[model samples]
Target chain A: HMTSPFKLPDESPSWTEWRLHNDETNPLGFKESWGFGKVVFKRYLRYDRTEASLHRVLGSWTGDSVNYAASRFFGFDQIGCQYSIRFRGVSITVSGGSRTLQHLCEMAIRSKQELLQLAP
Target chain B: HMTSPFKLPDESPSWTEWRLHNDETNPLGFKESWGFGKVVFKRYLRYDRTEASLHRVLGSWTGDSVNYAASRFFGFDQIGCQYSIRFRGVSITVSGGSRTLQHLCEMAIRSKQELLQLAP
Candidate 1:
């Protein structure tokens, strides 16, 4: 039902960046949205699925202040490697193969491109 | 000079979204860049400058998980209202007037737009 090319599950690997509706609820199962309006401009990432134990991999890595900053920027949980963002009642979480997550972070530090955008 | 319409200082108030080079350093003050190459696809925000206690505003706001996730998505420092992201050695931080920060976060929850992109 999502119009964006960035599909979940299978197509997730190919996405370097893209925006999708954070149309789901939180752990408490509450619908998320600011009191003023709907939620949008949500950011996400896609990691290779082949690498399992993504959390374990992210756990082993020791990043500095900037690494922590990058993690914070992307909503990345340092321990789990899952990036989470919450506002009002809405929330979105992004996680993937450890290698893929690492690659995405690595790519973030190298390439000078913003591939993600609001899908038309 | 940067070519992006999202200029710093004076113009910071107007930017909702835009990609810029994370062409800065961390607290340690080191030139940041991935070992592989230049850093890019960096995300940032512009908070209103008038509110001096930007950090205080972000701290008092009791956001849920999704809010935290959003903070991470944009690299916001919960206590300071500053969003930071880093990789290799590069890092970028964004902070503005507390009210503006709140507005940006508020707008993020309502609008479905991704206005930021790489500058040509």
Candidate 2:
């Protein structure tokens, strides 16, 4: 079993429970990592799996540009909603999302902070 | 003058000189902020300015997804290389850029770490 070094709190502040898309590719469903090396997150997919990349999302949203840059600086796919820097092999993609994904993004940014060696 | 809470190092480890596009509007020119409230950065423009936005990029790279998500979780515009989550108003966009922009993006991700009291 591949255990994630990170996990979201039980629920979003809105009181919405975290959706766990448990499956093979992502055994823990919502377990993600924005720590060192590879930053990771799995979506609600077929058997819990999907991927993407492009290198967009910075034009409209500069905040995530850092996230995108950091990740690519590190790697996401059109997965959708909320800006993103996803990667499987080549480039990074920035997409958009809701509350659960928002918090997922939040933790990743914190991880991005630790890795960047920047932050107050 | 508006002071930035964060700044990139004197130079990238590769020894590439950081370009300072000084001018009005952006007093410090290259002085960007991925700190809090607002994540800012100016480009190498006519007077050192330009902006753009589009929610793309995450389809390819995932690491920046967290960054992208984090930023919108927090905001950029792109006007180029990696990935991004920028915002002036309306929806946040994800774009791409180069090294200086890379560090800019990097700093922003670190900032994205903050905020999100309602984070995951």
Candidate 3:
């Protein structure tokens, strides 16, 4: 049998280990984590018609989330398409790929829409 | 004569106002400003033969500069491919166009190489 891409990582840290938190379990749906302990999550569902629009929204939303995460985690503010930080002998880095980030944003929007449909 | 792409902006605030500070006068010389008081400057000159390499370096260096600027200007941490902040009622926003940013990086690299030839 094939394994789900959303499975959590094993005891050891694996860069490829990733999981997608969907509406069935996670609240607001679209969240993802690489086994390295870094996760991307957003509070709003914004849908767009074009790649530019989606890129803009995702770049703003998740980018901000990661930016803040870096600051809070590292005690300093910095900017970039990705982030790297060290805390208590552990280092965490997040380098978001444009396509993957957009895809995640789209999934988040869809999850929100689906949940809306199930609302009373 | 047509205006150079690096021409300085007039008194009024212009989104398109841009200038490239090469080694002609500026030291270490790979600086750019979009005329809204936001500038991207690096102390080191890093050159690459490919776009990916250039993009990675620029995104790391300039992105960090912008990230730090935004934090200092806004007193909070946030992230985006662009930036917007209001200082004393003047609103300044920077939304980086990927191609344009890459072009600037190339120009910066070329400027550095040109200067190196003139060095003693």
Candidate 3, which segments miss by more than 4 Å at Cα? A1-120, B1-48, B51-56, B59-65, B75-120
Q: If ranked by lDDT, best first, what sequence of candidates would result?
A: 3, 2, 1
Model 3 lDDT tens row, B34-111: 221243322223333345644443343343343344343332332222322221111222232332333323332332
TM-score (C-alpha, index-matched) for candidate 2: 0.19
Which residue pairs collide, candidate 3? none
Off by over 4 Å in 1: A1-80, A86-120, B1-5, B9-26, B29-120
The digit string of per-residue lDDT tens for model 1 on B1-104 reads: 32211112122222222222233311221111101012122223332222443332222222242244333334333332333333222233322333334433
All candidates' TM-scores?
Answer: 0.17, 0.19, 0.18
Tell me the tens digit of each residue's lDDT in model 1 across A12-50. 222233222233321221111101012122222332222
DockQ for every model, please.
0.02, 0.05, 0.02
Cα error, residue A97 of model 2, in Å, equals 24
DockQ winner: 2
Rank by TM-score, highest first: 2, 3, 1
Worst 10 residues of 1 chain A by lDDT: A28-37
Report the interface RMSD that candidate 3 achieves against the true structure, in angstroms. Answer: 18.3
Clashes (backbone N, CA, C under 3 Å), per candidate, total 31, 90, 0
- Model number with the top lDDT: 3
Query: What tens-digit string does per-residue lDDT give for candidate 2 at B1-120?
Result: 343222222212222323333222221212112222334432211112222211121112234433443344222443233223322111222233332344445543433223212212
Regions more than 4 Å wrong, model 2: A8-35, A39-120, B1-42, B45-120
